[PDB]
Design a protein around this motif. Sequence first.
Motif, PDB file in Angstrom:
ATOM      1  N   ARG A   1       0.948  -1.218   0.113  1.00 28.32           N
ATOM      2  CA  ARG A   1      -0.088  -0.031   0.014  1.00 28.32           C
ATOM      3  C   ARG A   1       0.943   1.281  -0.020  1.00 28.32           C
ATOM      4  O   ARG A   1       0.303   2.340  -0.131  1.00 28.32           O
TER       5      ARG A   1
ATOM      6  N   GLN B   1      -7.405   6.373  -0.998  1.00 26.44           N
ATOM      7  CA  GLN B   1      -7.358   7.032   0.430  1.00 26.44           C
ATOM      8  C   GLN B   1      -6.506   6.085   1.293  1.00 26.44           C
ATOM      9  O   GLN B   1      -5.837   6.758   2.273  1.00 26.44           O
ATOM     10  N   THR B   2      -6.613   4.664   1.022  1.00 26.77           N
ATOM     11  CA  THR B   2      -5.950   3.634   1.672  1.00 26.77           C
ATOM     12  C   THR B   2      -4.453   3.647   1.495  1.00 26.77           C
ATOM     13  O   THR B   2      -3.559   3.014   2.271  1.00 26.77           O
TER      14      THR B   2
END
Lengths: 79, 29, 86
Positions: A53, C22-23
């Motif tokens: 991420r 957003q993550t």
Amino acid sequence: ELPLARIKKIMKLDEDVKMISAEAPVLFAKAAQIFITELTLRAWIHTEDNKRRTLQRNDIAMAITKFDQFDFLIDIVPR
Amino acid sequence: VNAKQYHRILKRRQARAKLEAEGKIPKER
Amino acid sequence: REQDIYLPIANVARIMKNAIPQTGKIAKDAKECVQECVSEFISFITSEASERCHTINGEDILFAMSTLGFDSYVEPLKLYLQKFRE
């Protein structure tokens, strides 16, 4: 958002560029935004492919090699 | 390599070399 | 001084964050990398626009963008400059 004064300074790094019209930095501010956006989205492809991420410099290096429009960045961020 | 960019890439290599050969940008950073 | 050759990191970063979920997160090194890419992008186009005639103007930049393979940017940019000056 992005600071015009700073865009101008970057343009004025080149010895040949001496006079810049006032509009020119405005165009670059928007263009730089569009460019950051597409580079980042293309880099993110590789971020996800490595099950992260967090986007990293190598993701940008990869995305540069995958898009002929980014050929000018090969020297900047080598894969 | 992109036929549209090829010539301008070469020019920018030379421009970056010059600024380096001065002190206006670093080798790496 | 870095303030003399790059856009401010946080401003570059804000644009990148908008581009990812957003993550998502962005490494400091990647912010710095885009910082470098964006300066090269400005210089690349500018250098071409410099050899468009012979003042570098908005039309010169737009043509250079067309020449160098950024044709997709032209209409959005003209619409932007329009709103900007109105």
